Amino acid sequence: KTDVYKITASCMHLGEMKFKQRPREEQAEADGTEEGERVAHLLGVNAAD
């Protein structure tokens, strides 16, 4: 019950990951964590990975 909803709802969660322009190269890293954490936990994938 919880598991199908856990995998289903991260697909709302993922589009929050707001990359920002840091023009020294253009390699952006995204401004936060919570955005992708609420993805990570519902999956149990290595949070550092």
């Binding site: 840091r22 020294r24 190269e25 390699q27």
Partner: protein
Amino acid sequence: MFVLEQEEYKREGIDWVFIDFGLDLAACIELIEKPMGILSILEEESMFP
């Protein structure tokens, strides 16, 4: 050990004044005036009897 860590630091946008340490050796690996130089003369000439 001095530079690469900083090449990301300067991009992060963190309060970090850059640290130069004055240890460079780039100007010997390839030729300033024409790329390779010696190798190209060395190669092209050899066939000339």
